[PDB]
Amino acid sequence: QFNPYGDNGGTILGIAGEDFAVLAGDTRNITDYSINSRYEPKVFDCGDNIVMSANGFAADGDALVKRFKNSVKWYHFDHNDKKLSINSAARNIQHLLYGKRFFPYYVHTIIAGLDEDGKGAVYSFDPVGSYEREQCRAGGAAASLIMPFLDNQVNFKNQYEPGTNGKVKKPLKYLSVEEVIKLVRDSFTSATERHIQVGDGLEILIVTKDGVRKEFYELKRD
Amino acid sequence: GSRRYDSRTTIFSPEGRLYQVEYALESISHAGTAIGIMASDGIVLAAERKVTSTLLEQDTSTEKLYKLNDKIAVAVAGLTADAEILINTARIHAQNYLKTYNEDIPVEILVRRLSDIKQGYTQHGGLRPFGVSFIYAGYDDRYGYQLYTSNPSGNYTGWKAISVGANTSAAQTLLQMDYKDDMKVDDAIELALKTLSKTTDSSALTYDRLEFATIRKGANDGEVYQKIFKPQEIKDILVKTGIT
Amino acid sequence: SDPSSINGGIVVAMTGKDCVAIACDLRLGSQSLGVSNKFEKIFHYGHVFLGITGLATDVTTLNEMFRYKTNLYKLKEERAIEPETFTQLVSSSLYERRFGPYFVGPVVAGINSKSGKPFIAGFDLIGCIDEAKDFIVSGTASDQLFGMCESLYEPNLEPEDLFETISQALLNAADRDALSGWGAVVYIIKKDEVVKRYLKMRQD
Amino acid sequence: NNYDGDTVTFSPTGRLFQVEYALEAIKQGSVTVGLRSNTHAVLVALKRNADELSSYQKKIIKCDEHMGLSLAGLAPDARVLSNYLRQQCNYSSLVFNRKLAVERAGHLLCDKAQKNTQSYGGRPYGVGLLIIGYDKSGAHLLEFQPSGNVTELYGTAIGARSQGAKTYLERTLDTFIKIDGNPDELIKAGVEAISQSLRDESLTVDNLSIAIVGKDTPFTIYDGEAVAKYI
Amino acid sequence: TQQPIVTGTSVISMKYDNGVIIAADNLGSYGSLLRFNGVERLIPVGDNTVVGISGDISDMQHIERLLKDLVTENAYDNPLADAEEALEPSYIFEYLATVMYQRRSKMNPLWNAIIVAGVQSNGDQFLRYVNLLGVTYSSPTLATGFGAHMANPLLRKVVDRESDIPKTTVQVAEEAIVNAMRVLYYRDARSSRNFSLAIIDKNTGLTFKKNLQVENMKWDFAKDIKGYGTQKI
Amino acid sequence: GYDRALSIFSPDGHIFQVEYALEAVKRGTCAVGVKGKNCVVLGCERRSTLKLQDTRITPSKVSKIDSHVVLSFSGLNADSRILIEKARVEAQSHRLTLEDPVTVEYLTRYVAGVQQRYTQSGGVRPFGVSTLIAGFDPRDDEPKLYQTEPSGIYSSWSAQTIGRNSKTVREFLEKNYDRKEPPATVEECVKLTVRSLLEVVQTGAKNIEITVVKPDSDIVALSSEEINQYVTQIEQEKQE
Amino acid sequence: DRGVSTFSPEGRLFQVEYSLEAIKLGSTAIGIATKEGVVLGVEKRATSPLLESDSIEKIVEIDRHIGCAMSGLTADARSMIEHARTAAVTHNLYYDEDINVESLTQSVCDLALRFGELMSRPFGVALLIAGHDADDGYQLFHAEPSGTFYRYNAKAIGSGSEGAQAELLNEWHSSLTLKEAELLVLKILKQVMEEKLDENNAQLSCITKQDGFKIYDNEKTAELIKELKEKEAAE
Amino acid sequence: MDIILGIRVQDSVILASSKAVTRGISVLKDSDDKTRQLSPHTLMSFAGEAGDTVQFAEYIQANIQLYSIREDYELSPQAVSSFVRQELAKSIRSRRPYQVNVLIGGYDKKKNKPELYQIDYLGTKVELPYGAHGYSGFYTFSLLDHHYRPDMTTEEGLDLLKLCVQELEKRMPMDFKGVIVKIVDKDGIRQVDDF
Amino acid sequence: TTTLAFRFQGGIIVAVDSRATAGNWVASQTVKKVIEINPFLLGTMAGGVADCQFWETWLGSQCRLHELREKERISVAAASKILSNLVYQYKGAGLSMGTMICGYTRKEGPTIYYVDSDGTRLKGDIFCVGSGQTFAYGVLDSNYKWDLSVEDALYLGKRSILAAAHRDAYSGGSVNLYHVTEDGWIYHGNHDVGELFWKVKEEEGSFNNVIG
Ligand SMILES: *[B]([O])([O])[C]([C][C]([C])[C])[N]C(=O)[C]([C]C1=[C][C]=[C][C]=[C]1)[N]C(=O)C1=[C]N=[C][C]=N1
């Protein structure tokens, strides 16, 4: 019998800052126990200061990204070159995904950018189109490895202040872009160590008012 | 293109009349007269065949009176071929109702269905209307004995006594004169024949130029019988009523 | 699960000297549960009689379908349908549902009004005609009915003698079937009189 | 006369009157100019208002990052045809990862318009289009007519009083074709060209509409104070 | 949904400084039966692209007809069909990728794995993969089926990352490919000795080599191997 | 299918087929609607050219769309049946989905929408019918009376008439109907409706039909004798 | 006869030009746009005094931020309004935001030329569509059955349109307040109406950023009519 | 849903239907009315798969009410039962059949006789003096076979119905949270509020 | 999932948890299981995360269109039936929904409809839906009265979710409270279960089984 689905591995991570937002993803692409590519870009600049990644079955991921990019283009045509806001993009993606409710895109989608007040924004989707704005979200193969670390080191969960013993929580002080990139790099270094589908390279896309910047870092190739 | 040749059968005149309906009624006014008379104990249907021949096989012939079911019959005035199309539809509608509700179709519901079909041809589709007028004679347990008529417009009305086809103006006047509410079938038989005998364009009214039918409760106990008269039976009733 | 044996029931028909007989049980059930003891399975359209076993909803549906068709036939033809002609109509109607069939076992019985010749016929659920000289059986106790008929039957039985034979064939066959019984009816049919008799039988 | 009732009817001299009547709608429309060098391709369009309270009707429509057009005639028909181009440009990108050639874009418009001229019930399009674009064979300018005829040109103009601008371009042919690597001077030549079609009215800040596409220049449209520089 | 009947095995490929190389054997298998021995599985498109196909052969021949038709269609009303508006490797791939994913989406796939190798207009090396699921990816080295498991490890020792491409000559690259084909013949039970190889260079163009054979094979050591453990004779 | 555009504009900006449909309405028997303080009355003309009629079975001029709404009409009888059927179906559909009977305004809007659709659809002619729709919204005691016409426009009326000689009875109503104080009772409302028809009808025998609709699905048709008493009282007051 | 989508020798569609003549017979509608809001006003024109005038609905809500007035064959407008409402709500469903006034108008105008031998004829009604959005602020559009739409600072449609437009030419400036605009619509309506203007035969409405689209009460309009009378008598 | 009963006496038809609604593990409601009035003198109770039951009942209700308005006449119980049977017989060979069993209790005003019709989801119709759907008959039919006499009063019918419900409450595993009882006679339909 | 809604003197209380799970993996603790259909209508979410989100925001579009067309607030009965009729069309296809449609109108008063993907539509006073519905029912049934103050009713809902958050493994995260009056709903905050459990335990004297 023909199986229309496959698993290409990989992992992605979105973090929202005070006036910025990052969307990272490893560059490794696999099937079963073989590597297809050590560098296959997975996070994409879709225009309007919006970055996107659809992790899981790559053929469905590429299809979805391709159709959203197309949606941005037709949004400009139909509404006098209006900038597509991150919240509007998110709702549009819900309908793209749910449109194939009974033959789903087999992907975990994350988008990132700035909201209309300039503050950092990250949205997360399931395969059939449900979504939710978040401060923090890892997706894909090693999502179970990374998320707990991000609950602890981004949202200071289960952390309290010395001397008070469980009475006073650690205050939720804001994190700079330099501080977030440190946490992203460590998250992937750790994920690479313990997950066989993660490795080769890390590509981070940073989003600010000035635009979309890129940073690349080497990861272990075993 | 094709627009050039379209007669536009479903349009209003400046006066707000439907051209094709009006012209179809003109056609029907030349058809053989058909009369329906309703009595307390039954209904009579009488109708004149159009200029026949001695070589026409009468006993196996049917152009005027048709059976829709065991309780309902119709007298036709107009194009016989058009009428048979509608008759077969009406026969099916009756059987559909019987299958659905396990009860014989009420007369009015059957009449409304046929009349709605006729209406459709006047409002949409671009086709010519049916050149037919019916007299419906029927019985059901709600209203008892009933007479209706329908015409190419798809409009229908109920009657105590009514005529369609040729010389209706003269026929309706005669019926209006001699009809009474407490009348019986035997009397209504005589009235129907006498009215035809006076309105006919022929020299004399004979058995070979007529089609006759009664719907009587004159069936053994609480039930209804349809009688389509045979040639010899029409000849006998003509002698009995004193016309020949 | 098997549609033909959810409700249960039987029909049998026989020929005699210038006569025919058709009979049926009165049970309708939902597998083990007995529901109705007044579910007659023999219907008639003019002088042509039709018995139908099998799934009860289809028994009712087909009766209503053949009443529909025989009523149109009579209006157009200006005569009652004959057994031979009706048999062909049943076959045609069943085969049109070849790949979504009515789960039934029909039986036709009647005397041709012109020739006077007795006539019976049976069908499978999809239209095949069995036209026997002697007898036709149908239903959940068809095996039992075959055994009774094959031993009890003789040709050229008088109407009143034929009644006894067909009744004993039905009764004893029904008593060996869990899904049949709960009463029975027999139709004796002559050229211009038809007698209907309800039989006293065990109600378990 | 008797042969202008529908598009499916030739006249005795072999003319299609409904198509010719559609061509007339273009001549009533406001003037628009198109010209190009080797590096860039420019559209200049005189927008038309209903009155002093009304806005000036938009003349130029973007089809892709590398292609667009200006219109003259029935604006809704331009919307239909431009929408068709947008889709065809988009089909070429999604399926073949290929920017649609300007010449091929003309061939598609020709065939779409043609079907409306040979069938009963329908009508021809009532608009003329000037398509500019930069593809793998450099700058291009096309002229579309709703008869189906499409033509590649160095320069042209369509609409009312378009003959004046068309003559000027015919004189300036040798000069403006050489304007390479200088967008402002090429627009100046387009503005000076459309000026030869003006009467009574002059080019104001909300009257003028300019569009450009080139080597390292995406298809952009200039309106308002962005064209005050060229007045 | 179907099953593949007559099948082709590995296609292998890699980039080098001035272009790309691709290769595949000439066998059409019918299960374990090595049925057809003269099947060409590399199909050139113009003078700048070679499409290597593995898997079902009936579907391969269908794809071959689609590409042949694509060339015919591109030439229509195209004066620059042999110049600026010629078919690019990227155009041919994206078309195939579209078809493959559409066919899987109708639950009726073309049962193949495809590698499109070529050189673009600007001299850039093009090498990308696509299969019956519509999955796509690019890499300095690409291989299908058994090639993925045996060829890639060998070819990745020559070009491990992007920066190794300018440092890799055509002689070194072809040598690596030819060796990989030998290894596949040792170890793949559905392979043949006869194969075809294609080079696409930005300078010297498209070189298509037919009727190549695996040579310099080591078998002599087999004589010394006796029994399965304890046997001495 | 037959797709011919029958309803089209003319050089002066008129759609003649819609206007000729209004002429069919002008030919139809007169219909009148009057709303009181706590009731609505629908009056209808029966032409006495047709005697030997069976009034038991002959289609009545006023039709119940639901238990709380009624519809009368002027124009082509056959056309009116099609609108009535659709309206009855929509009334049951509304109860099924919204779990509440239609408002009179909603039912009117639907019927008016059907009429409009037939003025710009291919292969069909407009309905030669104008309607008067009257009743009471669910759990509401405010009387409702709406009118529709072949073009598809609709509106609410304190009192209105349609059909032949409607110009005359509208003249009567315009001087006799006071908005500040409408017919306070059923008697007063019926009397004003019969009076308005007597301006046009001829004989007050079997030529006038009256139907009274009250709140909470209370609808009744008056008999010959009951109406005849109104006819008697009106003329006896007039002899002065 | 002749095709429904036929061009005249001048290059105009016969049916479109004839529908424009039907619109000239319609009741007047006026719209004025300001920096403080957009005002919409209409002539009700009841055919008889027995007709309850409040049931005449010629001003209509499309969404909270978009209103609409009509003139001509008003029965034709119902399917246009239904489409507009659906488009406005559908866009909010797809994009979690309000739809641009221009984009809404464009969607309505796309229906216009969908006629042939689709519907059998063009719409016989013109629309004034007024609204607000964050990008282009307060806006007023005029949507015709030709499929064309113009933006306007001020605009009048219907039977008294050219007389009203000439008056709007002199009176409109960029610094008009909302109150000044309300009175101005009433003034010009009163001028072109056959019957004497009051709260029962005329209707006002507006659209502001804060409160959205509102149809004015008969009591509220009555006061503005009284305020108008006094300020005209003041000089 | 679960238990629906019916009994035809001298001058009326009595329908009894359980109040419980259970979705899996929990009893979400204990006051559910599993019946719809089709016409003033015809009542239909129902039980089957969730959703389908109410959807089917209301659909039938809408159709009968439409007929009533069109003809200004009430269909006989026999006519209504035949319509319902046909709809179910049509349904059983559909893409997704209605999984609904019904009882139709009516009073025929023409014949002055009460009438009870039992129809299952296949479209199997039978007229009965007393009837049930599901496992209800398994407990109740033996009692009805013994006590029923065709000339009972309405009060005697309710007592015989109480004896049926008591047996069900003793021997059935499921708690059906009592029954809503309704009576159909010459005066129409009314609910017994204490049972 | 634990979601409840109940009618009382002061209107309706709606309370939900925040947890979303994929098998044993906790996918989210910050899920909004109450959908604000308009200022007067609330919908609860249980079952398929996407099905519920998509079709309940869709429901809001149908309700807005109703009141644009009818110039009147849509009834809770009509709104709930739009959703139930929709999911009935999809019956068999595999939609997974358990929802309460809650609202307050003049004609109806406070009304709650249980709507479900098998086509079930039920009106009622109290409903609990989800994997932890049985736990929440225990607290509700023993403490529910018609004569509860808005303050006490809010707490009972909060406490019933807490009960289920504790015991049911597929419920937790936080509690979202809503109070529905005739002038609209009113949000009453996000309450972390991590902090709420210890606060309630200390103040209420409950959960003596757990050590703190
Ligand atoms: B709740 O448990 O029902 C919850 C409600 C939903 C609206 C957030 N559902 C889920 O957590 C479901 C799984 C489930 C658990 C227990 C009972 C029923 C269902 N999760 C999802 O639907 C889902 C989908 N994609 C990603 C994560 N979770």
Give the CATH architecture of domain A1-222. Answer: 4-Layer Sandwich (3.60)
Q: How far apart are CA G14 and CA G21, in angstroms?
A: 11
Ligand 1 site, CB within 6 A: A 126; I 1, 20-22, 27, 31, 33, 45-49, 52, 130-131, 170
H23 has which bridge partners?
A: H26
Ligand 1 center to residue F73 CA distance, Å? 57
Chain C residues lying within 8 Å of B67, measured CB to CB:
75
- Per the structure, how many domains does chain B have? 1
Work out the burial of residue D185: count CB atoms within 10 Å of its CB; fewer than 13 is exposed, 13-18 middle, 19 or more buried. middle
Q: How far are the Cα atoms of B213, B216, B217, G193 from residue B221, in angstroms, in the given order?
A: 20, 11, 8, 77
Name the DSSP class of D227: G
Backbone dihedral angles phi then psi of residue G213, each to the nearest 5 degrees: -80, 125
Q: How far apart are CA B217 and CA B221, in angstroms?
A: 8
Are E87 and E46 within 8 A, CB to CB? yes
Q: Does domain D1-231 have CATH number 3.30.365.10?
A: no
Helices (H), chain D: 17-28, 75-96, 102-118, 162-176, 183-194
Are H15 and H35 within 8 A, CB to CB? yes
Counting every residue written for chain F, the total comes to 240
Are D178 and D40 within 8 A, CB to CB? no
Q: How many CA atoms lie within 13 A of I73 on its CB side?
A: 18
CATH of domain E1-233: 3.60.20.10
Q: How far apart are CA H192 and CA H180, in angstroms?
A: 7
Residue with CA closest to ligand 1 atom 24:
I49
Q: If residue F23 lies in a helix (H) or strand (E), which one and from where to where? A: helix F16-27
Ligand 1 center to residue I31 CA distance, Å? 10
Nearest CA to A83 among A59, A116, A112, A53? Answer: A116
Cα-Cα-Cα-Cα dihedral sign, residues G110, G115, G120, G121: positive
Backbone dihedral angles phi then psi of residue G140, each to the nearest 5 degrees: -135, 125
Ligand 1 center to residue A9 CA distance, Å? 23
Are E13 and E142 within 8 A, CB to CB? yes
Q: How far apart are CA C131 and CA C120, in angstroms?
A: 6
**Token pair in block for residue F146:** 């709406």
Are G85 and G63 within 8 A, CB to CB? yes
Ligand 1 center to residue I22 CA distance, Å? 7
Pocket test for ligand 1, best of I1, I35, I53 (most atoms within 8 A of CB): I1
Q: How far apart are CA B23 and CA B5, in angstroms?
A: 19
- Strand ranges (DSSP E) for A143-219? 201-208, 211-218
The β-bridge relationship of strands I184-192 and C28-30 is unpaired
Are D6 and D148 within 8 A, CB to CB? no
Q: Does domain I1-212 have CATH number 3.40.50.300?
A: no
Atom of ligand 1 nearest to the CA of I131: 17
Name the method of structure determination: X-ray
Cα-Cα-Cα-Cα dihedral sign, residues C4, C6, C7, C13: positive
The residues of I annotated as belonging to the active site are 1
Q: State the residue range of the domain holding B210.
A: 1-244
The β-bridge relationship of strands A50-56 and G154-157 is unpaired
CB proximity list for D33: less than 8 A, separation 6 or greater: D43, D44, D45, D130, D155, D156, D157, D162, D165, D169, D190, D193, D194, D197
CATH of domain F1-240: 3.60.20.10
Looking at beta carbons, which pairs linking E204-209 to residues 24 or more positions away fall under 8 Å? E205/E47, E205/E48, E206/E44, E206/E47, E206/E48, E206/E50, E208/E42, E208/E44, E208/E50
CB proximity list for B46: less than 8 A, separation 6 or greater: B34, B35, B36, B37, B75, B192, B193, B195, B196, B210, B211, B212, B213
Instruction: Locate the domains of chain D by residue range.
Output: 1-231
Q: How far apart are CA H86 and CA H80, in angstroms?
A: 10
- Per the structure, how many domains does chain H have? 1
> What is the spatial order of strands in the sheet that E194-201 belongs to?
E141-143, E11-16, E19-25, E194-201, E205-213
Q: How far apart are CA I114 and CA I121, in angstroms?
A: 6
CB proximity list for I153: less than 8 A, separation 6 or greater: I6, I8, I10, I13, I179
The β-bridge relationship of strands H100-108 and A50-56 is unpaired
Q: What share of chain B is helix, strand, coil (3-state, %, to 5)?
A: 40, 25, 35
Helix axes C159-174, C142-152, angle to 10 degrees: 140
Atom of ligand 1 nearest to the CA of A128: 25
Q: How far apart are CA A195 and CA A189, in angstroms?
A: 10
Give the number of other CB atoms < 10 A from CB of residue H79: 20
Q: How far are the Cα atoms of D53, G166, G167, G173, G184 from residue G170, in angstroms, in the given order?
A: 10, 7, 6, 8, 11
Work out the burial of residue A103: count CB atoms within 10 Å of its CB; fewer than 13 is exposed, 13-18 middle, 19 or more buried. exposed
Instruction: Locate the domains of chain C by residue range.
Output: 1-204
With CA atoms as reference, the chain G residue closest to A95 would be G94
I190 has which bridge partners?
A: I176
- Per the structure, how many domains does chain G have? 1
Chain H residues lying within 8 Å of C30, measured CB to CB:
120
As a whole number of Å, the CA-based R_g of chain E is: 19
> H52 at the I interface (CB within 8 A)?
yes
Q: Do chains D and C touch (3 or more CB pairs under 8 A)?
A: no
Are H119 and H91 within 8 A, CB to CB? no
Q: Cβ of F92 and H65 within 8 Å?
A: yes
CATH of domain C1-204: 3.60.20.10
Q: Cβ of D121 and B1 within 8 Å?
A: yes
Are B41 and B173 within 8 A, CB to CB? no
Q: How far are the Cα atoms of B171, B198, C6, F28, G166 from residue F165, in angstroms, in the given order?
A: 31, 39, 69, 10, 43
Chain D residues lying within 8 Å of B5, measured CB to CB:
none
Residue with CA closest to ligand 1 atom 1:
I1
Nearest CA to H60 among H34, H78, H76, H81? Answer: H81
**DSSP labels, I65-126:** HHHHHHSSPPPHHHHHHHHHHHHHHTTTS---BEEEEEEEETTTEEEEEEEETTS-EEEESE
Please identify among residues 70-109 of chain I the ones whose CB lies closer than 8 Å to any CB of chain F.
70, 75, 77-78, 81-82, 85, 107
The residues of E annotated as belonging to the active site are 1
Q: If residue E91 lies in a helix (H) or strand (E), which one and from where to where? A: helix E89-105
Q: If residue E128 lies in a helix (H) or strand (E), which one and from where to where? A: strand E125-131
CB proximity list for G50: less than 8 A, separation 6 or greater: F157, F158, F159, F160, F170, F173, F174, F177
Q: State the residue range of the domain holding H152.
A: 1-195
Give the resolution value in Å.
2.8
Q: How far apart are CA D210 and CA C9, in angstroms?
A: 89
Q: How far apart are CA A60 and CA E99, in angstroms?
A: 14
Number of CB pairs < 8 Å for B and D?
Answer: 5
Please identify among residues 2-31 of chain B the ones whose CB lies closer than 8 Å to any CB of chain D.
2
